Each structure stands twice: as C-alpha cells, then as structure tokens.
Amino acid sequence: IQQINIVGNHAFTTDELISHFQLRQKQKLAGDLETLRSYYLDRGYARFNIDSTQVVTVNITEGDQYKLSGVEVSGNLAGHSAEIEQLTKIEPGELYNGTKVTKMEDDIKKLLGRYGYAYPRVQSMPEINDADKTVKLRVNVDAGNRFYVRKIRFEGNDTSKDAVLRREMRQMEGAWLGSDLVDQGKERLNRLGFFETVDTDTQRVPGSPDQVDVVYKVKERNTGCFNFGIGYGTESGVSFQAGVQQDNWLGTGYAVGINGTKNDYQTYAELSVTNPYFTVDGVSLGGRLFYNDFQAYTNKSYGTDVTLGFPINEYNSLRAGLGYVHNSLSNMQPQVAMWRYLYSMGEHPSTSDQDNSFKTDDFTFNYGWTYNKLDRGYFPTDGSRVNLTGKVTIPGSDNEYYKVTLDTATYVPIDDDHKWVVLGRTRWGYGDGLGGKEMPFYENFGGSSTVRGFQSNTIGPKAVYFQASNYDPDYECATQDGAKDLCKSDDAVGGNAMAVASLEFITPTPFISDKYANSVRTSFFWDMGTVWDTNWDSSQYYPDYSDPSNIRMSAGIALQWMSPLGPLVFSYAQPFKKYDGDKAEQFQFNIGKTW
C-alpha cells in the first residue's frame, strides 16, 4: 500500500477522507469513492463529483454546500396526506442530505404497505437551484392498487403438522396484505427453534390483479435424541441410566422429557410434559413428577408440580404453578453448618452423632415472568432475555421460606453481518426464611453454567467436622477416635446468597467454516462470582462466610458448534483469582443443549 493523494480537496484534510478507506485492490476502489460521495453528498455538497483517479491520486471537483429549499408531494396518494407530510417535513434551511431523501422515499414505501399497498411506486425528483444553492424535492407517489391474500400454504413439512405453523402467522387469510406483517412469521418460526431455515415468497395470483399468495418454506431440524446405557459386569453389578428428550415429540407440539437411573447408591426418575398451546390462543400448561434418593447417609425425596401460563403481549409472558416435595434423610454426617439451622428450626439431635433423621412434606407455590426479544433460536445476535422466577412456601408446610432467582442475558451486534457480538450474562440468587426459621440447607447454589474456572459446586463456604462415626479407616475430625476440635473441611455447601456475572465476545470462525458447513462460533470470555451465607454468625469464628465481596475470577476461550446429535460445547478456562478452599478446573466439555 502506497501514499494516497487527493487533489481538489479544500474543505477537509486527507485523513478526514482516508479514515474511511479500506487501504490503511482496484476492484473495490469505487466503494470508497461512493463513500466519498456520501461523505460529501450527506453534507450538502449537491454538486460533489468524482472526476478521475490514477494509480493513488483522486482528482475531485469540490462544489458548494447546498441547503434544502422545500419539498413537493405529488402522485396517486389515496389519503394519508398528513402522514406523508410527516415523512417530508424538514427544517427550512437545513443541510441537504441525499441519504435522508432516500430514507424518506423508503419510509413512504413502508408506510403505505400496512394499508394494502403492496407495491407502490415512488420516485424522487430533486431540483438543484444554483442561484440559491439549494435542492427542492418533488416526489411522484403512485400508491398502486390493493392486494388481498387468497391462500397461505406451507411446503417442506414432513413431521410437524400444519396446525402448528398456522399458529404463528399474524397475516391471516381473507384480508388485505400487510407486506410488513408477514415477515413477523420468520421471527416466530425462529423463536420456536424447530427449523433449519425459514424464508418467504410473495407471489401474484395469475387470475386477477388484486390477489396474492404468501408461501413459507422451511427445513426441519432434528428435535431430540434418546440415550440409553447400562454399566454391567460380574464385579461391577448393575448400573443403569436411560431417558428420552424431544422438544417436538413426533412433531405434535408437545415437549416430553423422561429420564432416570438406578445404582447401588442413588436412584433418579423424572418425567415432564408440557403443551405450549392448551388453548387455541396460546395458553400453555405442563408439569412434572420426580423421585430420587441416595444411600451412603440415606436421603430420599420426591415430588411434583404443575405450571400454567400465558402471554400478556407480543413480547412478554407470565407463568405460575403449584407443587410439593417430600424430603427425608437419616444417618447424616453431623454438621454445625447445618446444626445452626436444624436446631434453629427446632431439631434437637445429639451433637456430632451421625445417628439422626429428619423428614418433611412441604407444599409450595412457584411463579415467574419472562421477557424475550431474542432474534435466533441457536446463535443469538440481538435482543435480550430476562427470566425472573421464584417460589414461596404454602402455609401448613414444614419448611416456610421463599427464594427468587434472576437470570438475564443480552446480545448486541457489532458488525452489520452480526459476526461479532457482545454478550453479557448475569445470575442473581436471593431468598430467606419465614416464621423466624432459616432457609433449607439444600437450596444452596461452580460449573460450566457458571464461573468456568472452578470445579463444579465448589464455590462458597465449607463444612466442618466434629460424637460417633462407625467407619473404620477416614477423617479424624469426623469421629471421637481422632477428632480434637473444630476442623476445616474442603466439602462445599454453597449458600443462601449468590451473585455471578460473565462477559463474552462472540467472533466468527472463517478458519473453520472454510472446512465445515455447519454453524460455529468462538468467543473470548471472562467470568466471576461468589456465594455467601447471610446471617452467618462470624462472631464465633476462620474465614467470614458473610462477606459478599470474596469474588473469584477466571477467563478463557469458548467454542460453540452444532452436531447431528444435538449441540455440543467445550471451553478452556484459566482461573486467575482464587480464595481458600480452591478447587480449580479448566477443561469444560459437555453437551451444548444450553442457552
């Protein structure tokens, strides 16, 4: 790249123009010259012209700066004269701007579409006044005719039934075309996440000038997979896990999840079903039933819930529901981190004696609110999501409490192609007890869904050890044989307060897309957060568990890609800021069925 000269440039210096050039190659020079034209044209230089170039020197003629003199409106305008004026009113004496003129024309083209004028013809006719360096604008506005939509049909649906897609369009048959309204169907289908691609075709009806059809074409994406396996041997015994997940079960519009596992120590089973359209106008219902347990202590629980909800406007919805869970435990490792709650809740077990039990059957009410303007189902580029949910216990339950969880994320593009995007994510977790009691010990909040640089469920306050433990060695502090005093432990318990945030810089992967045809992104990330224990009695203690400022941090690189078996993700993190009880991790590899 060599020195670039501009001659005939007197209102500006060289850099004022060069900063918009792609050179600090001939085939693209016009795009900088047109930029140069806009630079001048958008500043009133109605006579600005490109005269010649040589290879680099650009020889230009600099004219004067023109003002607008006024605007004339003509053509087959079927009313809406005031609205047309709104698109044409200017401040007398304001600077001529060619882009503004084009914009005004496009605004007219758009405005008339909602009234059935699918194809208006609008032409600007600028007039240059040299006696008075101004431009007068005349526009010929031919509104055109009125178009009605006769049939709307879909092609390419092998699994989904049409009853689902016709729920998403806002343009309905038997009415005039709003050329702008049909396009919202693309967003609706994109939000469902059921398709590889969606597009549209507006076509004229050959039988008459006033009828059109609207055709949508989609390509269905795989909606879920079944996973089964059992680990079996003559020494291993039986280790079972299986389940199925479909987001559009055989295309019926229902979401179904069935999972479970069985082994010598823990049991899980959970089934959930939901219908996004119980009613024709979008009322949704669904719920689930679960069971689980653990055997060495012993802990068993089970429960169920049902949720109903509905949209309240084009972009927002509410849901709420009821359910309950039974909880029982016995022979649990004694822990003062729990005792100061259990005794506070009225429990009076022997101190440091594992031989104990506790069980309740607690009924609760849950609710939440969401906001969603995200523009894609898999690779968001714009919009944001807000998910505020929480639950409060139902009077008559044994554990009376409440908790609220907030999860937000925002995507803002940088470039016109949305190849680079700024992404923010934040988590909040707060709650408290009711009736003078404390929060459940099992509601405490590390992992791939949170600060990446630490081991899963390791962030926060740790347990301590102290009567009886009948295992023959492993901790001296756990038993009367070796314990002498209050002991530290690396066993995390989490806590009743959480604050976590992360930031990602999403970039394109042209060095990968050159080889692979699927959707792939890479991002740079930072994450950090902390968990703490509100009302921890630090006066008796050791680290202070009430301190909310002990924020820990990690950062690294994340990769996002789709595969035939569903989305998969991996990121590599490097922890940088840590506190005591550090249990770091860096290789985060898991299923991509997230976000």
């Binding site: 879920g224 079944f226 089964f228 396996g229 059992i230 079996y232 041997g233 035939p564």
Partner: peptide, 10 residues
C-alpha cells in the same frame, strides 16, 4: 465388563 449404549435421534 460391558458398557452397552445406543443413541437414536428425533
């Protein structure tokens, strides 16, 4: 001894 598994997608 064995870790039998299979996958079927929808």
């Amino acid at each position: 001894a064995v870790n039998a598994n299979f996958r079927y997608c929808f």
